[PDB]
Amino acid sequence: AHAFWSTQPVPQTEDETEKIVFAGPMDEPKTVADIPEEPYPIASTFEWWTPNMEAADDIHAIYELLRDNYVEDDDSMFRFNYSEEFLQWALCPPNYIPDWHVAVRRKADKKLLAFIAGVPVTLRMGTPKYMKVKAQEKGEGEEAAKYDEPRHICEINFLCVHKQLREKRLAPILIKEATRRVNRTNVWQAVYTAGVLLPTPYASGQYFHRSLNPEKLVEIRFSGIPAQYQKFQNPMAMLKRNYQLPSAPKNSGLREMKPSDVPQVRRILMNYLDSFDVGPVFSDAEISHYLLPRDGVVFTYVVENDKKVTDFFSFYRIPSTVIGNSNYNLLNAAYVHYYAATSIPLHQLILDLLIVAHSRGFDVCNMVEILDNRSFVEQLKFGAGDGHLRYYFYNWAYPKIKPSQVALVML
Ligand SMILES: CCCCCCCCCCCCCC(=O)SCCNC(=O)CCNC(=O)[C@H](O)C(C)(C)COP(=O)(O)OP(=O)(O)OC[C@H]1O[C@@H](n2cnc3c(N)ncnc32)[C@H](O)[C@@H]1OP(=O)(O)O
Ligand SMILES: N[C@@H](CC(=O)N1C[C@H](CO)[C@@H](c2ccc(Cl)c(NC(=O)Cc3ccc(F)cc3)c2)C1)Cc1ccc(Cl)cc1
Ligand SMILES: [Mg+2]
């Protein structure tokens, strides 16, 4: 049933998953010197390419591939349109490895046909808490704790094959070549998400959406006027009233983050992310890169009380192409990113997020039910979307966890 994934070091069924009790590697330990030094052989009409993310033309090529061929909704009404500035930010964090960005071009005209990207992440991925309690019952705490240390691994994203080349087994070729480049740098695990079911996720969660401009969302059919709103003499006036927001944040210590906040935001975020079984560890350079405001890309605000940062939130921007509306070309979406609340309830912190996003002209705020994102769904008028986001590891055995134990945001 899975000619490619059946050959790979991942759990093969949910039943195999069920019997996983400790974190650890799936495969034979291997060494760097065992891995072939040359790229995988490929069809003579194609060539492997390592883009230069410092070259505008190279970023543009990836931008165009994704604009026309990346993820769509179910009914082909929307397609993500990551910007060039966003791609530079997502693909080039501190100490990124250029060779982890793998592409296939057509030899004759250098047209970009397929891409996959790997970036470094330092991840805690040791045995989850509920299994550590089970281990204590069995007298097995040391084996359960063996891989507690954060690990330097690969996060894989942006896998894309051009529409004209779909169903020709090119995606396995990409994933094998990515794996070889990552293994040649002595890294043997990867983490990735997908909106489809593959062998075999360790967590799964619903998407959630908070309308900010309901009149536009209904014009472009992202939203409907829900059936209950018809019994009303006037639907859209009532929908706008339901989702109205104040003009300005309610917390008077809220301001944009600046470079001098980096140490305090690192500390409050790392103390919060400790709570979770799987989550990133960030240096000051990584907090600077992923959280300092960047025009059109990432937006971050801190609550400062008595010259101390006590809370913060961040959200990032991804517009989507609206396929065939005469009125609107683009959905302007905000996505909840990292945050930490120490001084006020989380719902009060995130209400300020919605206020800021709305004032900045975003149409919708979206998120997955990781972190403590459930705690504020109902009070802040989020609704569940369609399908689920699935979280996976490569070459890592891991017990199933709830998505409220996951703290890694994937862009
Ligand atoms: C240590 C380092 C390890 C590094 C690597 C870690 C693993 C990284 C793995 C990648 C994580 C990506 C994270 C993200 O970016 S998820 C976002 C994926 N991108 C899109 O959805 C964009 C639009 N769609 C496409 O571009 C194509 O449909 C893709 C490229 C998805 C498949 O192209 P195509 O439709 O032309 O198919 P094929 O004939 O070439 O190949 C069919 C085989 O591919 C398996 N397939 C289908 N979809 C996915 C998917 N999303 N992850 C993994 N495998 C997938 C499928 O089950 C089948 O295998 P098998 O069932 O026969 O066995
Ligand atoms: N490797 C993953 C990365 C990922 O997990 N994402 C990337 C995506 C944007 O940051 C995020 C996400 C977070 C929260 C929500 Cl509500 C949605 N979904 C939507 O925005 C709806 C939507 C679906 C398709 C569209 F073409 C446009 C909008 C998507 C989840 C690839 C992927 C991309 C997009 C999706 Cl929907 C699912 C998976
Ligand atoms: Mg293919």
Q: Is 161 annotated as a binding residue?
A: yes
351 is a catalytic site residue: no
Distance of CA 131 to the CA centre of its chain: 26
The residue count for the chain: 411
The amino acid that residue 199 corresponds to is P
Neighbour tally for 354: CB within 10 Å:
25
Phi-psi region of 58 (alpha: psi -120 to 50; beta: other; left: phi over 0): alpha
CB burial class (10 A; 0-12, 13-18, 19+) of residue 292?
A: middle
Q: Which of 217, 291, 351, 411 is catalytic?
A: 411
> Ligand 2 pocket: which of 318, 335, 377 to mutate (most atoms <8 Å of CB)?
335
The amino acid that residue 164 corresponds to is Q
Closest by Cα among 347, 338, 351 to 248: 351
Strand partners, 121: 153
**Inter-CA distances, 47 with 168, 170, 293, 383, 403, Å:** 16, 13, 37, 45, 39
For ligand 2, atom 21, name the residue with the nearest CA.
73
- φ, ψ (nearest 5 deg) of residue 339: -160, 170
CA–CA separation, 322 vs 319, rounded Å? 9
Give the angle 74-76-79 at the CA atoms, nearest 5°: 100
Pocket of ligand 1 (CB under 6 A): 2-5, 69-71, 154, 156-161, 166-172, 175, 178-179, 182-183, 187-190, 192, 194, 196, 198, 394-395
Whether the upstream peptide bond of residue 200 has omega within 30° of 0, thus cis, is yes
Can you give the three-state secondary structure of the chain, one letter per residue?
Answer: CCCCHHHCCCCCCHHHHHCCCCCECCCCCCCHHHCCCCCCCCCCCEEEECCCCCCHHHHHHHHHHHHHHCCECCCCCEEECCCHHHHHHHHCCCCCCHHHEEEEEECCCCCEEEEEEEEEEEEECCCCHHHHHHHHHHCCHHHHCCCCCCEEEEEEEEEEECHHHCCCCHHHHHHHHHHHHHHHCCCCCEEEEECCCCCCCCEEEEEEEEECCHHHHHHCCCCCCCHHHCCCCCHHHHHHHHHCCCCCCCCCCEEECCHHHHHHHHHHHHHHHCCCCEEECCCHHHHHHHHCCECCCEEEEEEEECCEEEEEEEEEEEEEEECCCCCCCEEEEEEEEEEEECCCCHHHHHHHHHHHHHHCCCCEEEEECCCCHHHHCCCCCCEEEEEEEEEEEECCECCCCCHHHECCCCC
Quick one: tokens of 7? Answer: 């050959």
CA–CA separation, 174 vs 40, rounded Å? 10
Sequence-separated (6 or more) residues with CB below 8 Å from residue 210? 243, 354, 364, 365, 366, 380, 381, 382, 383
Q: How many Å lie between the centroid of ligand 2 and the Cα of residue 316?
A: 12
CB burial class (10 A; 0-12, 13-18, 19+) of residue 277?
A: buried
Quick one: tokens of 146? Answer: 């063996």
Pocket of ligand 2 (CB under 6 A): 71-73, 78-80, 157, 192-195, 207, 209, 318, 320, 333, 335, 366-368, 385, 389, 410-411
CA–CA separation, 338 vs 346, rounded Å? 12
Closest by Cα among 362, 316, 358 to 82: 316
The experimental method behind these coordinates is: X-ray
In Å, the largest CA–CA distance within the chain is 73
Give the angle 316-157-285 at the CA atoms, nearest 5°: 55
For ligand 2, atom 8, name the residue with the nearest CA.
411
Q: How many Å lie between the centroid of ligand 3 and the Cα of residue 163?
A: 9
Q: Is 2 annotated as a binding residue?
A: yes
The CATH number, out of the four listed (3.40.50.720, 3.40.630.170, 3.40.50.10780, 2.40.40.20), of the domain defined by the range 1-411: 3.40.630.170
Q: How many Å lie between the centroid of ligand 2 and the Cα of residue 390?
A: 11
Please tell me the number of the ligand nearest to residue 4's CA: 1
For ligand 1, atom 61, name the residue with the nearest CA.
2
The amino acid that residue 121 corresponds to is V
Quick one: tokens of 408? Answer: 């890694």
Q: Is 193 annotated as a binding residue?
A: yes
Q: How many Å lie between the centroid of ligand 3 and the Cα of residue 161?
A: 6
Which atom of ligand 2 is nearest the CA belonging to 157?
A: 1
Q: How many Å lie between the centroid of ligand 2 and the Cα of residue 387?
A: 11
Antiparallel, parallel or unpaired: β 279-280 and 383-394: unpaired
